[PDB]
Design a protein around this motif. Structure first.
Motif, PDB file in Angstrom:
ATOM      1  N   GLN A   1       0.817  -1.206   0.000  1.00  0.00           N
ATOM      2  CA  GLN A   1       0.000   0.000   0.000  1.00  0.00           C
ATOM      3  C   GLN A   1       0.852   1.258   0.000  1.00  0.00           C
ATOM      4  OE1 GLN A   1      -1.046  -2.763   1.584  1.00  0.00           O
ATOM      5  NE2 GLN A   1      -2.993  -3.014   0.516  1.00  0.00           N
ATOM      6  N   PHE A   2       2.070   1.180   0.530  1.00  0.00           N
ATOM      7  CA  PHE A   2       3.000   2.301   0.454  1.00  0.00           C
ATOM      8  C   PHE A   2       3.463   2.535  -0.979  1.00  0.00           C
ATOM      9  CE2 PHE A   2       7.617   3.137   0.328  1.00  0.00           C
ATOM     10  CZ  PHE A   2       7.617   4.452   0.718  1.00  0.00           C
ATOM     11  N   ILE A   3       3.745   1.455  -1.714  1.00  0.00           N
ATOM     12  CA  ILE A   3       4.176   1.545  -3.106  1.00  0.00           C
ATOM     13  C   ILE A   3       3.043   2.048  -3.991  1.00  0.00           C
ATOM     14  CG2 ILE A   3       4.950   0.125  -5.072  1.00  0.00           C
ATOM     15  CD1 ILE A   3       6.389  -1.598  -3.106  1.00  0.00           C
ATOM     16  N   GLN A   4       1.812   1.608  -3.712  1.00  0.00           N
ATOM     17  CA  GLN A   4       0.667   2.016  -4.519  1.00  0.00           C
ATOM     18  C   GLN A   4       0.372   3.504  -4.398  1.00  0.00           C
ATOM     19  OE1 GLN A   4      -2.562  -0.503  -3.336  1.00  0.00           O
ATOM     20  NE2 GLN A   4      -2.271  -1.875  -5.084  1.00  0.00           N
ATOM     21  N   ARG A   5       0.692   4.111  -3.259  1.00  0.00           N
ATOM     22  CA  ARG A   5       0.431   5.522  -3.030  1.00  0.00           C
ATOM     23  C   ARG A   5       1.573   6.417  -3.488  1.00  0.00           C
ATOM     24  NH1 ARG A   5      -2.669   3.504   2.018  1.00  0.00           N
ATOM     25  NH2 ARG A   5      -0.651   2.961   2.947  1.00  0.00           N
ATOM     26  N   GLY A   6       2.419   5.939  -4.395  1.00  0.00           N
ATOM     27  CA  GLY A   6       3.515   6.741  -4.889  1.00  0.00           C
ATOM     28  C   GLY A   6       4.736   6.757  -4.005  1.00  0.00           C
ATOM     29  N   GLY A   7       4.927   5.733  -3.184  1.00  0.00           N
ATOM     30  CA  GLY A   7       6.027   5.716  -2.244  1.00  0.00           C
ATOM     31  C   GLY A   7       7.349   5.291  -2.843  1.00  0.00           C
TER      32      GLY A   7
ATOM     33  N   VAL B   1      -4.812  10.373 -19.428  1.00  0.00           N
ATOM     34  CA  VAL B   1      -4.503  11.783 -19.612  1.00  0.00           C
ATOM     35  C   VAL B   1      -4.799  12.134 -21.059  1.00  0.00           C
ATOM     36  CG1 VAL B   1      -2.792  13.577 -19.402  1.00  0.00           C
ATOM     37  CG2 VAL B   1      -2.753  11.673 -17.841  1.00  0.00           C
ATOM     38  N   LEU B   2      -5.655  13.129 -21.260  1.00  0.00           N
ATOM     39  CA  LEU B   2      -6.122  13.520 -22.578  1.00  0.00           C
ATOM     40  C   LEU B   2      -5.307  14.649 -23.181  1.00  0.00           C
ATOM     41  CD1 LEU B   2      -9.862  13.394 -21.619  1.00  0.00           C
ATOM     42  CD2 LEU B   2      -8.560  11.681 -22.844  1.00  0.00           C
ATOM     43  N   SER B   3      -4.838  15.583 -22.359  1.00  0.00           N
ATOM     44  CA  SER B   3      -3.951  16.651 -22.811  1.00  0.00           C
ATOM     45  C   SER B   3      -3.158  17.131 -21.611  1.00  0.00           C
ATOM     46  CB  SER B   3      -4.738  17.801 -23.422  1.00  0.00           C
ATOM     47  OG  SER B   3      -5.481  18.482 -22.431  1.00  0.00           O
ATOM     48  N   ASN B   4      -1.834  17.111 -21.711  1.00  0.00           N
ATOM     49  CA  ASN B   4      -0.960  17.523 -20.615  1.00  0.00           C
ATOM     50  C   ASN B   4       0.098  18.468 -21.168  1.00  0.00           C
ATOM     51  OD1 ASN B   4       0.185  17.751 -18.093  1.00  0.00           O
ATOM     52  ND2 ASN B   4       1.262  15.798 -18.191  1.00  0.00           N
ATOM     53  N   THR B   5      -0.114  19.770 -20.974  1.00  0.00           N
ATOM     54  CA  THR B   5       0.896  20.777 -21.266  1.00  0.00           C
ATOM     55  C   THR B   5       1.409  21.442 -19.995  1.00  0.00           C
ATOM     56  OG1 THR B   5      -0.515  22.722 -21.539  1.00  0.00           O
ATOM     57  CG2 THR B   5      -0.409  21.176 -23.369  1.00  0.00           C
ATOM     58  N   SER B   6       1.137  20.846 -18.839  1.00  0.00           N
ATOM     59  CA  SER B   6       1.636  21.344 -17.570  1.00  0.00           C
ATOM     60  C   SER B   6       3.084  20.909 -17.362  1.00  0.00           C
ATOM     61  CB  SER B   6       0.752  20.858 -16.428  1.00  0.00           C
ATOM     62  OG  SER B   6       0.607  19.455 -16.472  1.00  0.00           O
ATOM     63  N   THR B   7       3.632  21.248 -16.202  1.00  0.00           N
ATOM     64  CA  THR B   7       5.027  20.973 -15.896  1.00  0.00           C
ATOM     65  C   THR B   7       5.239  19.609 -15.264  1.00  0.00           C
ATOM     66  OG1 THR B   7       4.928  21.994 -13.705  1.00  0.00           O
ATOM     67  CG2 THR B   7       5.366  23.416 -15.580  1.00  0.00           C
ATOM     68  N   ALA B   8       4.179  18.843 -15.055  1.00  0.00           N
ATOM     69  CA  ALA B   8       4.276  17.507 -14.498  1.00  0.00           C
ATOM     70  C   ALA B   8       3.987  16.472 -15.573  1.00  0.00           C
ATOM     71  CB  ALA B   8       3.308  17.326 -13.334  1.00  0.00           C
ATOM     72  N   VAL B   9       4.637  15.319 -15.452  1.00  0.00           N
ATOM     73  CA  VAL B   9       4.480  14.239 -16.418  1.00  0.00           C
ATOM     74  C   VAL B   9       3.178  13.513 -16.120  1.00  0.00           C
ATOM     75  CG1 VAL B   9       6.963  14.078 -16.549  1.00  0.00           C
ATOM     76  CG2 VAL B   9       5.727  12.511 -15.096  1.00  0.00           C
ATOM     77  N   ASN B  10       2.730  12.663 -17.056  1.00  0.00           N
ATOM     78  CA  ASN B  10       1.434  11.997 -16.927  1.00  0.00           C
ATOM     79  C   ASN B  10       1.397  11.041 -15.749  1.00  0.00           C
ATOM     80  OD1 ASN B  10       1.559  13.190 -19.450  1.00  0.00           O
ATOM     81  ND2 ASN B  10       0.269  11.635 -20.409  1.00  0.00           N
ATOM     82  N   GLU B  11       2.544  10.467 -15.398  1.00  0.00           N
ATOM     83  CA  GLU B  11       2.590   9.445 -14.367  1.00  0.00           C
ATOM     84  C   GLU B  11       2.389  10.030 -12.976  1.00  0.00           C
ATOM     85  OE1 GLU B  11       5.691   9.498 -16.534  1.00  0.00           O
ATOM     86  OE2 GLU B  11       4.440   8.545 -18.057  1.00  0.00           O
ATOM     87  N   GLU B  12       2.881  11.251 -12.736  1.00  0.00           N
ATOM     88  CA  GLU B  12       2.624  11.935 -11.472  1.00  0.00           C
ATOM     89  C   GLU B  12       1.148  12.242 -11.301  1.00  0.00           C
ATOM     90  OE1 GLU B  12       5.409  15.146 -10.505  1.00  0.00           O
ATOM     91  OE2 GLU B  12       6.504  14.625 -12.328  1.00  0.00           O
ATOM     92  N   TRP B  13       0.514  12.718 -12.377  1.00  0.00           N
ATOM     93  CA  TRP B  13      -0.914  13.002 -12.378  1.00  0.00           C
ATOM     94  C   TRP B  13      -1.727  11.751 -12.097  1.00  0.00           C
ATOM     95  CZ3 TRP B  13      -2.874  17.561 -11.910  1.00  0.00           C
ATOM     96  CH2 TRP B  13      -2.197  18.672 -12.404  1.00  0.00           C
ATOM     97  N   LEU B  14      -1.392  10.645 -12.764  1.00  0.00           N
ATOM     98  CA  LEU B  14      -2.187   9.434 -12.604  1.00  0.00           C
ATOM     99  C   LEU B  14      -1.970   8.776 -11.248  1.00  0.00           C
ATOM    100  CD1 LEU B  14      -2.117   7.885 -16.153  1.00  0.00           C
ATOM    101  CD2 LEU B  14      -3.789   9.398 -15.080  1.00  0.00           C
ATOM    102  N   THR B  15      -0.750   8.836 -10.708  1.00  0.00           N
ATOM    103  CA  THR B  15      -0.507   8.285  -9.381  1.00  0.00           C
ATOM    104  C   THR B  15      -1.157   9.125  -8.289  1.00  0.00           C
ATOM    105  OG1 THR B  15       1.628   7.694 -10.339  1.00  0.00           O
ATOM    106  CG2 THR B  15       1.288   7.178  -8.017  1.00  0.00           C
ATOM    107  N   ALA B  16      -1.259  10.443  -8.479  1.00  0.00           N
ATOM    108  CA  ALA B  16      -1.935  11.250  -7.469  1.00  0.00           C
ATOM    109  C   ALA B  16      -3.453  11.184  -7.585  1.00  0.00           C
ATOM    110  CB  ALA B  16      -1.473  12.697  -7.557  1.00  0.00           C
ATOM    111  N   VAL B  17      -3.992  11.109  -8.804  1.00  0.00           N
ATOM    112  CA  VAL B  17      -5.432  10.979  -8.998  1.00  0.00           C
ATOM    113  C   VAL B  17      -5.913   9.577  -8.625  1.00  0.00           C
ATOM    114  CG1 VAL B  17      -7.153  11.074 -10.904  1.00  0.00           C
ATOM    115  CG2 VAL B  17      -5.585  12.916 -10.571  1.00  0.00           C
ATOM    116  N   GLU B  18      -5.015   8.583  -8.638  1.00  0.00           N
ATOM    117  CA  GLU B  18      -5.359   7.221  -8.238  1.00  0.00           C
ATOM    118  C   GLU B  18      -5.821   7.133  -6.785  1.00  0.00           C
ATOM    119  OE1 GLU B  18      -3.091   2.856  -8.222  1.00  0.00           O
ATOM    120  OE2 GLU B  18      -2.316   4.536  -9.402  1.00  0.00           O
TER     121      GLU B  18
END
Ligand code: MG
Ligand code: ZN
Ligand code: ZN
Lengths: 463, 142, 61, 76, 581, 303
Positions: free
Chosen positions: A84-90, F38-55
């Motif tokens: 769960q730590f890895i899944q949350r971007g850890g 991600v449909l359009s990303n012209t921000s300063t963050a890559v798609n993977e940061e967005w998807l991991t935080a929105v997850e």
DNA sequence: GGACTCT
DNA sequence: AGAGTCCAGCCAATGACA
RNA sequence: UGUCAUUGG
């Protein structure tokens, strides 16, 4: 100065390999790099780390560690990590690779599933290990260099220059989460790879319901004499009790690289922090909070363990040695042209060199047929090769007849014997012939032997 | 690069051919290092100079400076050091990028090149050596 | 881009991110409602990385 | 090291009967040239000479020669 | 011929050298230019001193010659390489293979009267990857075609479980590095080995890589199944101690499991786990860890100092009992009694029970076990700063008696020996103080985990605890202290021609107090000297190892128990007994 | 405060508390937004940061009124973010997301209500505003388990279907096929002290949602207890079994362990125990479970 | 840099 | 007594360059 | 197809 010397040498070697905030132009520079995704500034630092702005360009994350044995899996620097730590971007990273191909313009204007009508790779596409990034067809017979990594990678940027030769530069990116075998370390040279990715429901917990993100074994902390790691966990937990000064501003904890303040001053600082947080505690609870000792509970039986566990937060670093960057496998592939053995590289899909010390090990095992089948050429690469018993070179088939040219020019007609040797053996013998050394092989016309029955022999003793 | 020295001299050193390099000027490139990295160019400054060869004979009260050959000027491309905040020593007016410290050179293939410091070979104290016993050596340099 | 939950315990720290980074309160007034030490370290140590603007277009010929 | 009448080092082959491929595998660049000068005829019984000609070494299970008795197959 | 000089393709040298030979082969041409062309085609170092010219002698030039690189060693097909990790579902007889390896690597199934139905079934279900036709002598990759299966042909399918893979770690220093065990399907991208084989291969799980090779020849399959199996290689072939065993946490688990007392039947069965099936409670209701060990051994054998009727008559179970390559191993005694299968079964069952003890009870060392307060370290600090000033005043009294002339001076060797003896006495005083503190701590706090792993026999001794809590000692370089440079001193922190022994490398502080700047200099001097020495000695050890291995490798035991090489009898009886070592 | 950490402490039997804790951690699964495009990303963050935080958006604060239908997998949800740079309020909070529920009975995608306290959140801070170059981000994230086909793309009327189909075909090979989930809150039970570490928000009542979660858990736990049977005869070491010829129960299950530890045994996973199976009363364990759930709801009512 | 051999 | 000659662990991995 | 640089066990 609180650890031993070799640990400081290894820590200085591993600090340059830690993943950090590498560049501000992460989406702009087409270049190789590894970038940390959710970075955290270190808090238990020196002033030289503040003034060089290494602390601002963060090189790790604060995780919760436990110094205990987790079912005997933590052995030989293996670490347990929470799923769960890895899944949350850890401790999540991004690897960006740069690919650069140089195409003839007639080859560009002339495996291609990710290409568009522009002859270039599509943006935001994930490239698999047989995919070409641009069209390159030479007169069909396409000769495009292809993607060769074990993992996929998202096409982040494409930069194309049209000249006499088309230059295509593709920047691809991949999010790498911690998997088994990924290297991690502390700022005390306490390094190791992921041995087990545990669920949060099979991890020990404390009274507050907190499971550790990382479980490190406690024996290697005291065998290697890395005393400053315990002080770093104590000072990190004392910051988490009181992260602000009396003005309210975020102040770090000054614990320098070569420290001259005693451990009792750090214990007094931690006591003041924990007494500011909770204004009255029992002194057993305060001594357990200062020394970062906690009663942990078995998640299966919900019963505590025998003794208290060193449990607390620390700045933890990911290293740039990932498992899929080192993972190699080969069933069949190309062969080199001279000796007709397997090729070399990992991008080329080459073989692992069965060296000479492995040959010594298979000789010492007594496995002669195993080392014979390893060292000889493959059974698929068999052909009937005849050698001349008089002059020693390979016979030729003119129009179906095995002849020796040197002996038919010398008015002989000698024996031709079929041989099963490696191709490198024949190349070596032909080159020694080119130096002038004639090598002539003799063969065993063994007398025909006959099995006869033997008498009974009993080797048991007589008492 | 500013040179004024006699190359050859004849006729009992009253005739001489002197080379003369002057007007050395160094200009920065007309872009930022990130555009040089993306587009493929190299972050190089351009220096130009004027080099003149002429023979110079001394009379009693005359100097016969007869121009043999001249060459006015881009001549040399020098690699430019990206400094603190992507600021080179030549661009006196540029906005500081708030995270880059620089210290690298951009190659012709957009490759970042970085350098270490090297210990000189010339020694500031003389060097002692024992070749064979009761035979010693004291080597110094100037 | 910030994590909206704590990466250790999984607790929501979005409101404290707004109270700390945008409203610009002190760490004391923000961490008055945060009790786990992992979430306090997330709110005290996590930053957004200093990044330049993305050069456009992403496909340039 | 003392199998001959004199102590012999681990760097050279002086008194021990070593074949030309054994000396070349050990590292001796003029081994085959000196064998060609002196017209040497050597049997293939060592590991370095068996690996050259793809022969099974005389180590372990390869220490013995193996035959097949076709009498019981021809009897029925 | 052209076979020694093929067409080089990337986007010959000998062909160009022969062209420079034939460019001078004319009737109006000197023999010197033809001789020079022939020489620089054959051997350039006859007339020159340059390397990197590809001539004929390039195949017999140094380490990278043809035999050493391509004949006694080669790059192989059906190979793999990956990072390793531990596994508790993998015994010492098994190895975990990642999914990408077993999705790439293939195994051979030969066509004969026994397996023709299995091969036809695997061809009907598209599980066959390659097919080799032996009579036409050709291999075909199956990406429906026509294939007729004759005896002698084979097919190649995905590699299955319980197939012997030959895997190993590098450098292969001895034959327990390269073994052959059974493939098990595991998770991840790491080759999962058991920890019990780890000390056999000098392996850690901190980033070590291991390689695999699959040799699916039937003679090689039988030799891998019998000769290279880890049950066959259980005992060391020189000193007989077991090659496999327990490591760091299982040592203290073994110690604390022997010391445990007054358990219920359910607690004993919880510790035993899956091996609690045939556990016999005779008439007892309370059990001890000695009863668990009596069940684990399972033989009524005696041994002087260790066993009596199966019970352990030793006082404690320490690292000499369970760690690999020790002279008091219980697995070694159990395999001396019956066979290597019994020793390998004791090793597997013991590792399971020790890890279950660690799962139930746990083991961790905290900072409170090392330094609970400041009392003992403050006492030893005061002791050291008293005694070293006593040493300095005695040495200054001797120096002033020499300087005013009341005594004749000593030699510098004897003076260094006298100061060496005084500082060694201070070091031994620190050692005795640390030992008395360890005794007093284990009689005050008998459940100290640091002293528990000290008593179990793992890596904690009074010298390491002196380095942490007492003093760091005198730092030696080349057997002596650090030599004096410019102005009769080492560092400018001391006066010219300083007689201070602390300025010559004696460290008064410890790791708990923290070394000062000069003390850190002398510690880093010793550390970097050790690093430079091991880097300089690694290649020399490798060269001597290869020389000795090539000299001794042709010496075998003959059919009469004698040790021979070639046709010379070295020993009349192998191992002086004509029995295995 | 808009969010307050609270604790619900119920003292129970130890094996009953362990059973409730393990049944919560095994059964109450709140899905995550792992299916992200991600449909359009012209921000300063890559798609993977967005998807991991929105997850890991805390979507139980928004989709609470459908908690039961999300817990039985009969209903999914959806977030959609289209947000560009601004002069003032140049940041992305959780109010900028559009939240949709997806009734899987109909593939009916309808917009749920949005709390105004979600304006006091933070996901992203944009860089310095320029109207010269674009700095925008658009993404859509589905809950885990949702099957993306033309039936649900026909309902996405708030976005471009062409861009969504192209970017979904780009990202489809990377999305995890397994059901990725989240536990709603921390549930422990040290020595029979069953503790819930919950987060209470100001804009909805936590007691109704907690009652829905506990009722779902009680139903699922009683169904799992009823459909639980222990093998008799001999034993191979994969499932929990009972040998009456020796009178030995082999425990290799968690439910079997907690049930026989309710009746005075001291078991662990994969262990043999002399335990008479005539002492196991299933109805007494179910009645203790029901009384424990009533005690849990009574403890939450005094929050 | 260092050991063996021919001179 | 002094120069020539050959020797300096194994297995990797990336990138740049000719 | 080989050099150089950096790194790993
Ligand atoms: Mg290692
Ligand atoms: Zn012939
Ligand atoms: Zn947290």
């Amino acid at each position: 100065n609180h650890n031993s010397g070799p640990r400081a040498i290894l820590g200085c070697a591993q600090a340059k390999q830690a993943i950090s905030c590498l560049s501000s132009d992460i989406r702009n520079k087409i270049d190789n790099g590894i970038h940390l995704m959710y970075p955290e500034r270190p808090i238990v630092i020196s002033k030289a780390l503040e003034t060089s702005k290494i602390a601002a360009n963060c090189f790790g994350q604060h995780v919760t560690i436990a110094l205990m044995s987790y079912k005997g899996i933590n052995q030989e620097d293996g670490i347990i990590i929470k799923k769960q730590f890895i899944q949350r971007g850890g401790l999540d990273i991004v690897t960006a690779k740069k690919h650069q191909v140089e195409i003839p313009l007639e080859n560009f204007n002339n495996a291609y599933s990710k290409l568009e009508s522009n002859g270039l790779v599509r943006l935001n596409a994930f490239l698999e290990s047989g995919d070409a990034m641009a069209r390159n067809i030479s007169s069909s017979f396409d000769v495009s260099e292809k993607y060769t990594d074990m993992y996929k990678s998202r096409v982040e940027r494409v930069q194309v220059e049209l000249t006499d030769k088309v230059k295509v530069r593709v920047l691809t990116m991949k999010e790498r989460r911690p998997i088994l075998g990924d290297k991690f370390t502390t700022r005390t040279s306490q390094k190791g790879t992921v041995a087990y990715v545990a669920d949060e429901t099979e991890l020990p917990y404390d009274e507050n319901g907190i499971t550790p993100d990382v479980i490190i074994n406690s024996t290697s902390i005291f065998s290697r004499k890395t005393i400053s790691m315990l002080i770093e966990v104590i000072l990190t937990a004392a910051y988490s009790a009181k992260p602000y000064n009396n003005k309210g501003e975020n102040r770090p904890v000054c614990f320098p690289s070569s420290n001259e303040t005693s451990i009792d001053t750090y214990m007094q600082f931690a006591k003041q922090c924990y007494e500011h947080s909770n204004p009255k505690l029992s002194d057993e609870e305060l001594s357990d909070k200062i020394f970062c000792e906690k009663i942990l509970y078995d998640p299966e039986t919900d019963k505590p363990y025998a003794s208290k566990v060193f449990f607390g937060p620390i700045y933890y670093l990911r290293l740039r040695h990932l498992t899929q960057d080192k993972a190699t496998v080969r069933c069949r592939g190309k062969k080199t042209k001279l000796i007709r053995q397997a090729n070399e590289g990992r991008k080329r899909g080459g073989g692992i060199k069965f060296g000479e010390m492995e040959r010594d090990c298979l000789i010492a095992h007594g496995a002669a047929n195993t080392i014979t089948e390893v060292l000889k050429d493959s059974e698929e690469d068999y052909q009937d090769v005849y050698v001349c018993e008089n002059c020693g070179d390979i016979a030729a088939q003119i129009k179906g007849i095995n002849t020796c040219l040197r002996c038919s020019k010398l008015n002989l007609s000698p024996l031709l014997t079929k041989i099963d040797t490696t191709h490198v053996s024949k190349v070596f013998l032909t080159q020694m012939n080119a130096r002038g050394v004639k090598v002539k092989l003799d063969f065993e016309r063994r007398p025909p032997s006959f099995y006869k029955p033997l008498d009974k022999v009993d080797l048991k003793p007589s008492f | 690069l500013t040179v004024k020295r006699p190359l050859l001299s004849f006729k009992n050193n009253t005739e001489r051919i002197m080379i003369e390099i002057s007007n050395v000027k160094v200009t920065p490139p007309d872009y930022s290092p990130i555009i040089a990295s993306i587009k493929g160019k190299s972050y190089d400054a351009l220096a130009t100079f004027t080099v003149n060869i002429f023979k110079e004979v001394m009379t009693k009260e005359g100097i016969s400076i007869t121009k043999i050959s001249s060459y006015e000027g881009h001549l040399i491309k020098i690699p430019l050091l990206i400094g603190y905040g992507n600021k080179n020593p030549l661009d006196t007016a540029k906005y500081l990028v708030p995270n880059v410290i620089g210290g690298v050179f951009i190659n012709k293939q957009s490759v970042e090149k970085v350098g270490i410091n090297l210990v000189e070979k010339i020694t500031t104290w003389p060097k002692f050596r024992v070749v064979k016993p009761n035979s010693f050596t004291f080597s110094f340099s100037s | 881009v910030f994590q909206l939950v704590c990466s250790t315990c999984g607790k929501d720290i979005s409101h404290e991110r707004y109270k700390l980074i945008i409203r610009k309160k002190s760490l004391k007034d923000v961490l008055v409602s945060v009790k786990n030490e992992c979430c306090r370290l997330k709110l005290s140590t996590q930053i957004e990385p200093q990044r330049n603007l993305t050069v456009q277009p992403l496909l340039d010929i | 090291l003392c199998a001959s009448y004199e102590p012999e080092s681990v760097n050279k082959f002086k008194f021990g009967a070593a074949s030309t491929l054994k000396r070349a595998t050990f590292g001796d660049n003029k081994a085959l040239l000196n064998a060609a000068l002196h017209k040497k005829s050597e049997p293939i019984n060592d590991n370095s000479s068996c690996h050259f000609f793809s022969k099974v070494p005389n180590i372990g299970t390869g220490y013995y020669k193996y035959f097949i008795d076709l009498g019981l197959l021809m009897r029925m | 011929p052209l076979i020694i000089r093929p067409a080089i393709s990337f986007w010959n040298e000998l062909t160009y050298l022969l062209g420079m030979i034939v460019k001078n082969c004319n009737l109006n041409a000197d023999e010197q230019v033809i001789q020079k062309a022939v020489i620089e085609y054959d051997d350039i170092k006859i007339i020159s001193n340059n390397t990197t010219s590809i001539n004929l002698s390039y195949i017999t030039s140094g380490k990278n010659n043809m035999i050493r690189s391509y004949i006694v060693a080669r790059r192989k097909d059906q190979t793999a390489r990956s990072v390793i990790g531990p596994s508790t579902s993998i015994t010492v007889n098994e190895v975990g293979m990642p999914a990408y390896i077993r999705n790439t690597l293939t195994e051979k199934i030969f066509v004969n009267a026994f397996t023709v139905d299995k091969v036809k079934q695997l061809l009907a279900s598209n599980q066959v990857k390659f097919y080799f036709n032996k009579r036409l002598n050709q291999l075909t990759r199956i990406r429906k075609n026509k294939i007729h299966l004759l005896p002698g042909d084979w097919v190649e399918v995905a590699v299955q479980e319980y197939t012997s893979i030959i895997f190993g770690r590098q450098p292969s220093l001895h034959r327990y590095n390269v073994i052959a065990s059974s493939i098990r399907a595991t998770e991840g991208d790491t080759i999962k080995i058991s920890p019990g084989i780890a000390n056999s291969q000098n392996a850690d799980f901190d980033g070590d890589e291991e390689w695999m090779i699959l040799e699916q020849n039937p003679k090689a399959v039988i030799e891998q199944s019998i000769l290279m199996y880890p049950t066959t290689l259980l005992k060391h072939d020189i000193h007989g101690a077991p090659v496999y065993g327990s490591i760091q946490d299982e040592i203290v688990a073994a110690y604390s499991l022997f010391r445990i007392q007054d358990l219920c039947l359910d607690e004993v069965l919880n510790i035993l786990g899956k091996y609690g099936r045939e556990f016999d409670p005779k008439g007892k209701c309370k059990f001890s860890g000695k009863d668990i060990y009596t069940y684990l051994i399972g033989e009524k054998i005696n041994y002087p100092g260790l066993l009596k009727d199966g019970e352990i008559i030793a006082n404690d179970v320490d690292s000499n009992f369970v760690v690999a390559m020790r002279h008091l191993s219980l697995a070694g005694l159990l395999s001396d009694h019956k066979s290597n299968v019994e020793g390998i079964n004791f090793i597997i069952k013991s590792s399971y029970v020790f890890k279950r003890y660690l799962s139930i009870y746990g083991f961790g060392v905290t900072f409170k076990d090392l330094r609970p307060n400041s009392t003992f370290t403050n006492k030893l600090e005061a002791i050291n700063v008293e005694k070293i000033e006593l040493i300095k005043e005695a040495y200054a009294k001797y120096l002033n008696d020499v300087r005013d002339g009341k005594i004749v001076p000593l030699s510098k060797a004897l003076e260094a020996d006298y100061v060496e003896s005084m500082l060694s006495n201070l070091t031994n005083l620190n050692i005795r103080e640390i030992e008395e503190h360890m005794r007093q701590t284990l009689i005050d706090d008998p459940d100290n985990n640091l002293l528990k792993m000290a008593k179990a026999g793992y890596k904690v001794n009074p010298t390491e605890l002196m380095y942490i809590l007492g003093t760091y000692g005198q730092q030696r370089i080349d057997g002596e202290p650090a030599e004096t440079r410019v102005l009769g001193r080492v560092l400018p922190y001391y006066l010219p021609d300083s007689k201070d022994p602390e300025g010559r490398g004696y460290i008064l502080n410890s790791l708990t107090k923290g070394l000062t700047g000069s003390q850190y200099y002398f510690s880093m001097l010793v550390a970097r000297s050790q690093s430079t020495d091991i880097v300089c000695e690694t290649s020399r050890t490798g060269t001597l190892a290869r020389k000795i291995i090539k000299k001794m490798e042709d010496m075998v035991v003959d059919g009469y128990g004698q040790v021979v090489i070639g046709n010379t009898l070295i020993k009349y009886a192998a191992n002086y007994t004509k029995i295995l070592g | 405060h808009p969010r307050e950490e609270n604790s619900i402490v119920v003292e129970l039997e130890p094996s009953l508390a362990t059973f409730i804790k393990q049944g919560f951690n095994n059964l109450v699964k709140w899905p995550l937004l792992n299916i992200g495009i991600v449909l359009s990303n012209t921000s300063t963050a890559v798609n993977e940061e967005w998807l991991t935080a929105v997850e890991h958006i805390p979507t139980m604060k928004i989709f609470y009124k459908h908690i039961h239908k999300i817990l039985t997998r009969e209903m999914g949800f959806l977030v959609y973010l289209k947000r560009s740079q601004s002069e003032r309020d140049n940041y992305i909070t959780l109010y900028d997301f559009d939240y949709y529920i997806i009734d899987k009975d109909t593939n009916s995608v309808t917009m749920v209500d949005k709390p105004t306290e979600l304006k006091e959140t933070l996901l992203h801070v944009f860089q310095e505003y320029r109207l010269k170059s674009s700095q925008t981000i658009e993404l859509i994230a589905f809950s885990s388990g949702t099957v993306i086909n033309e039936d649900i793309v026909s309902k996405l009327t708030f976005l471009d279907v062409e861009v969504f189909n192209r970017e979904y075909n780009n990202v489809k090979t990377i999305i995890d096929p397994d059901f990725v989930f989240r536990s709603p809150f921390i549930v422990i039970s040290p020595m029979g002290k069953l503790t819930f570490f919950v987060e209470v928000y100001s804009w909805f009542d936590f007691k109704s949602c907690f009652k829905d979660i506990i009722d779902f858990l009680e139903g699922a736990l009683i169904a799992n207890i009823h459909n639980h049977m222990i093998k008799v005869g001999n034993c191979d070491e994969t499932v929990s079994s009972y040998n009456p010829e020796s009178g030995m129960l082999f425990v290799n299950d968690l439910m079997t362990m907690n049930i026989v530890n309710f009746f005075g045994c001291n078991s662990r996973l994969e262990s043999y125990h002399r335990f008479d199976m005539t002492k196991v009363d299933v109805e007494l364990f179910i009645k203790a479970l029901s009384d424990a759930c009533k005690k849990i709801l009574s403890a939450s009512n005094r929050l």
